[PDB]
Amino acid sequence: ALLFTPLELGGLRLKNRLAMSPMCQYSATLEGEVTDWHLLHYPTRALGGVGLILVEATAVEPLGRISPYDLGIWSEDHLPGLKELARRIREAGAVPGIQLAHAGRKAGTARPWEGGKPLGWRVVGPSPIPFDEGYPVPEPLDEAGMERILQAFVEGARRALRAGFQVIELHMAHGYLLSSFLSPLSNQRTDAYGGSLENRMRFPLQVAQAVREVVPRELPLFVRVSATDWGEGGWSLEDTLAFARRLKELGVDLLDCSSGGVVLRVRIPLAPGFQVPFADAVRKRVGLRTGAVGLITTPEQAETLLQAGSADLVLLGRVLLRDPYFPLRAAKALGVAPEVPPQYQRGF
């Protein structure tokens, strides 16, 4: 059972191949601090059996937030709450990781259950092109802006390591800041950071590199990407291949393969494992380890994409929101005896 076989990354060993995918909770304080919500939400899924938890998008600057209730990491005062959250994650038996994020032209919307409407922030972008109707026109970054944000990512990693997180993921997916540099749908710059594939990769590759320099080799650096934006003439799987090789050269440990999010009006052919092809290709054609994600909900299905070499790691989101103990019960279903809290032995 490969799902429940340990997985070496950097100098770690994940006790299994299930990870909790990052999922925004919109439940931080207004100054972006960890609250009781997270201290219950994450250790629950850790008792639940995943080997790795990736804490939701965590803004590396106040204007990089999605919502006013996002986790932040732009401040030393975020350290105590973050350090407490990684500690309860480890104590409930998983490796604590965290996704560092900047929301670019999609920054500044209400929580989704409070309407999810733009708030009117000075959001920033590659090109002065609104995400969709009703959204602000991002102002396009000059080079000093880019360098400020790269530092914010670099200092956010340093701060996450000090908080005791052992796996950092760089969010470069879903139409947020770095993803929007990648795609020509959102990026129409005519300087060195737009136009060609190489140019559109430039800034995101500078960020990975500068973050990689401050994360020692023992701790894995993930990058999440939208493997395609699903748009006519948009970013494609082939582009993703090119971007993958450059990440591998820089020493990124694992590409976490999502898709979409750059613009709205595109056809997304959603289905169980619809993004699994993207993990499989990168892994087999570039030789960079991949995380698969997207409508993975069943133990036989996670096992199978593993057996097939489509990925190294299986990431779960939604199934864990409604069934946080999925992984303990999944093992049994694959004929593996689950390691469960002694308290709970008589439930298995």
Q: List, by residue number, the catalytic residues.
A: 176
In 3D, which of 103, 73, 90, 95 has the Cα closest to residue 20? 95
Note whether 63 and 124 are within 8 A (CB).
yes
Binding mask 167-206 for a copy of itself (x = CB under 8 A): ----------------------------------------
Residue 314 touches ligand FMN, criterion: CB under 6 A: no
Residue 324 touches a copy of itself, criterion: CB under 8 A: yes
Binding at 253: pick from a copy of itself, ligand FMN, none (beta carbon under 5-8 Å per type): none
Pick between residue 205 and residue 314 the one whose CB is nearest to a copy of itself. 314
Kindly state the smallest distance separating residue 33's Cβ from a copy of itself, in Å: 16
317 appears as a binding residue in the annotation: yes
> For residues 74-103, which are near a copy of itself according to CB under 8 A?
92
**Of residues 317, 324, 327, 338, which one binds ligand FMN by CB under 6 A?**
317
Binding at 281: pick from ligand FMN, a copy of itself, none (beta carbon under 5-8 Å per type): none
How would you class 301 by CB atoms within 10 Å of its CB: exposed for 0-12, middle for 13-18, buried for 19 or more? middle
Q: Which residues pair with 14 in a beta bridge?
A: 7
Kindly state the smallest distance separating residue 348's Cβ from a copy of itself, in Å: 6
57 appears as a binding residue in the annotation: yes
Kindly state the smallest distance separating residue 16's Cβ from ligand FMN, in Å: 16
Kindly state the smallest distance separating residue 319's Cβ from ligand FMN, in Å: 6
How would you class 202 by CB atoms within 10 Å of its CB: exposed for 0-12, middle for 13-18, buried for 19 or more? middle
Binding mask 47-66 for a copy of itself (x = CB under 8 A): x-------------------
CB atoms within 10 A of CB 160: 30
**Of residues 27, 67, 99, 183, which one binds ligand FMN by CB under 6 A?**
99
Cα–Cα distance list, 71 to 25, 74, 153, 185 (Å): 9, 10, 14, 28
- Return d(Cα 163, Cα 254) in angstroms, integer: 22
Kindly state the smallest distance separating residue 42's Cβ from ligand FMN, in Å: 13
**Of residues 15, 224, 283, 289, which one binds ligand FMN by CB under 6 A?**
224
- Return d(Cα 17, Cα 344) in angstroms, integer: 22
151 appears as a binding residue in the annotation: no
Residue 258 touches ligand FMN, criterion: CB under 6 A: yes
**Of residues 9, 14, 16, 21, which one binds ligand FMN by CB under 6 A?**
21
Q: Which residues pair with 290 in a beta bridge?
A: 255
**Of residues 102, 105, 106, 171, which one binds ligand FMN by CB under 6 A?**
171
Return the exposure string of 100-125: e unless at least 16 CB atoms fall within 10 Å of the residue's CB, then b.
Answer: bbbbbbbbbbbbeeeeeebeebebbb
Residue 348 touches a copy of itself, criterion: CB under 8 A: yes
* Residues placed in the known binding site for FMN: 21-22, 24, 57, 99, 224, 295, 317-318
Residues in contact with ligand FMN by the rule CB under 6 A? 21-24, 56-57, 99, 171, 173-174, 224, 258, 293-296, 316-319, 346
Residues in contact with a copy of itself by the rule CB under 8 A? 25-27, 37, 40-41, 43-44, 47, 92, 111-113, 317-325, 328-329, 340, 342-348
